[PDB]
Amino acid sequence: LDALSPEQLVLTLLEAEPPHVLISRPASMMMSLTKLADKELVHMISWAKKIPGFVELSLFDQVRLLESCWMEVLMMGLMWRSIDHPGKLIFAPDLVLDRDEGKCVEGILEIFDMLLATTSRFRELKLQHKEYLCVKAMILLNSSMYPLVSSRKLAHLLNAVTDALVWVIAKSGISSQQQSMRLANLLMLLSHVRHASNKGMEHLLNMKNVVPVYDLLLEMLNAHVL
Amino acid sequence: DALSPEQLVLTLLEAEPPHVLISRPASMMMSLTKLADKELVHMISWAKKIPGFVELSLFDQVRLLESCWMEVLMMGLMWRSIDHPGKLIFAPDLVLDRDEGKCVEGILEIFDMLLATTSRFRELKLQHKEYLCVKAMILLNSSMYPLVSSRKLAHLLNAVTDALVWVIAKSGISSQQQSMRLANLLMLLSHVRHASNKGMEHLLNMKNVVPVYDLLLEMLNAH
Numbered sequence: 342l343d344a345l346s347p348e349q350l351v352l353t354l355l356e357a358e359p360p361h362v363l364i365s366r367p368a369s370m371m372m373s374l375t376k377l378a379d380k381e382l383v384h385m386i387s388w389a390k391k392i393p394g395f396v397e398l399s400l401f402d403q404v405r406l407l408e409s410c411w412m413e414v415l416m417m418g419l420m421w422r423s424i425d426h427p428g429k430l431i432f433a434p435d436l437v438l439d440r441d442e443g444k445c446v447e448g449i450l451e452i453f454d455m456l457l458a459t460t461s462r463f464r465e466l467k468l469q470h471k472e473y474l475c476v477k478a479m480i481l482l483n484s485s486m487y488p489l490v491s492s493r494k495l496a497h498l499l500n501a502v503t504d505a506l507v508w509v510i511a512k513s514g515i516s517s518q519q520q521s522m523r524l525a526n527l528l529m530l531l532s533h534v535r536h537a538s539n540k541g542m543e544h545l546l547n548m549k550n551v552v553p554v555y556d557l558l559l560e561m562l563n564a565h566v567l
Numbered sequence: 568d569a570l571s572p573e574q575l576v577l578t579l580l581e582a583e584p585p586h587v588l589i590s591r592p593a594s595m596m597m598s599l600t601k602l603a604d605k606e607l608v609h610m611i612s613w614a615k616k617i618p619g620f621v622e623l624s625l626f627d628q629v630r631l632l633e634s635c636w637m638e639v640l641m642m643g644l645m646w647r648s649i650d651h652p653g654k655l656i657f658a659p660d661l662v663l664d665r666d667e668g669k670c671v672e673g674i675l676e677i678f679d680m681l682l683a684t685t686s687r688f689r690e691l692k693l694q695h696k697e698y699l700c701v702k703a704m705i706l707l708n709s710s711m712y713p714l715v716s717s718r719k720l721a722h723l724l725n726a727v728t729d730a731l732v733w734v735i736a737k738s739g740i741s742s743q744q745q746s747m748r749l750a751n752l753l754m755l756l757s758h759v760r761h762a763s764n765k766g767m768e769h770l771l772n773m774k775n776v777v778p779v780y781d782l783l784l785e786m787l788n789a790h
């Protein structure tokens with residue numbers, strides 16, 4: 342119970358953060374992104390396994406969640422590292438792209454503008470490092486409805502992370518009306534993260550020399566299962 | 568004053584869309600599309616009745632209506648289907664159960680997302696008052712752009728949020744549960760958004776039916 346306590350939880354999520362990912366480049370932009378995602382997914386699995394209680398859900402829910410949330414989590418990570426640089430998307434240490442470069446590949450410019458607009462909203466709200474840690478965890482736990490309708494366990498976990506975020510916002514010292522307003526503003530942004538995620542998935546599956554992230558993810562998920 | 572919690576909920580109540588009868592004189596997708604086209608007309612009227620909506624720039628109004636329509640229709644569908652598991656009450660003469668979704672390809676998947684989200688609202692015992700606030704929030708939170716008149720949209724969205732927070736408060740539950748319920752409700756919005764994106768994808772990937780999107784744009788120019 343205590344390992345899920347507001348303060349410990351945030352610190353545990355902190356240490357659980359993924360390492361920097363170097364794409365290491367010897368169609369192409371899409372080849373870079375795809376090779377980057379594949380690499381991040383490996384670390385995303387490790388990250389999820391570090392969230393207190395995640396490993397104690399049925400493997401079925403673990404897989405359900407990971408398969409449903411990956412694109413949202415990657416994008417949430419992207420928005421957070423791009424947060425202080427308007428007009429830019431810091432995908433990785435050797436892959437910084439600005440809005441315009443999104444004109445090369447068709448359909449990508451639209452997605453970039455969604456990510457840049459959602460990122461601008463997090464900057465305006467002045468998203469805190471620990472609010473970000475809670476939100477990203479919530480994105481994983483709230484990615485799939487089915488595993489909730491072990492279900493008892495997922496609901497408990499989702500509430501723990503929410504309590505943690507409510508706690509984080511509380512020590513912000515702001516009024517009670519503002520605390521509710523901030524919680525609501527943060528959670529309403531999840532809809533936009535989900536939205537950019539669906540567009541990214543759609544664009545990815547409408548694609549035809551790049552890396553097969555989804556299938557590689559399923560391989561990782563099976564290994565996670567074995 | 569019209570944005571005050573109690574007054575706002577009562578105003579949203581009266582603003583509710585009327586029942587919509589498609590009046591089939593046979594394609595499921597043909598019925599669905601004829602229904603949506605009819606609902607959209609009433610959805611515009613509904614939005615105009617939300618206190619302050621008509622005062623945003625026509626730019627934001629059009630912006631919000633264009634991107635939220637599918638989410639609002641689905642939020643409406645889930646609310647009327649809430650007490651009947653395995654079924655979707657699309658309209659007074661169009662009740663469809665899950666399996667009828669196997670006919671058209673790609674639809675069963677969407678029906679299951681809708682039935683699952685509806686299932687979740689039933690479990691949370693979504694109230695009429697909460698539903699009225701959430702649906703208004705779906706419209707106001709549909710597009711990020713008109714927010715990043717913006718001052719006006721932000722204040723409007725906050726007003727509806729206060730109303731929901733107020734609704735939850737008179738629930739008489741503890742403060743920890745109040746935060747938990749607000750959070751549980753708002754997280755469901757991600758799922759409504761999700762079923763909405765799937766429905767939009769399927770509609771455009773669709774191949775003897777009605778062009779809802781173009782008709783909506785006509786209504787928007789009329790607006």
Ligand SMILES: COCc1cc(O)cc2c1O[C@@H](c1ccc(O)cc1)[C@H]1CCC[C@@H]21
Pocket residue numbers: 371374375376377378379381415416418419432449452453541542544545546548554
């Ligand atoms: C294999 O995915 C490539 C990929 C293919 C695609 O069609 C669409 C996308 C892809 O990578 C996603 C991505 C997001 C965050 C990351 O940290 C990494 C990748 C975003 C990047 C821009 C659109 C979307």
Ligand SMILES: COCc1cc(O)cc2c1O[C@@H](c1ccc(O)cc1)[C@H]1CCC[C@@H]21
Pocket residue numbers: 596599600601602603604606640641643644657674677678766767769770771773779
């Ligand atoms: C013109 O829309 C037809 C339509 C075409 C489509 O490809 C997908 C969908 C459509 O109607 C939507 C709808 C939702 C709520 C309503 O009250 C009415 C329609 C949902 C119904 C199931 C999938 C999605």
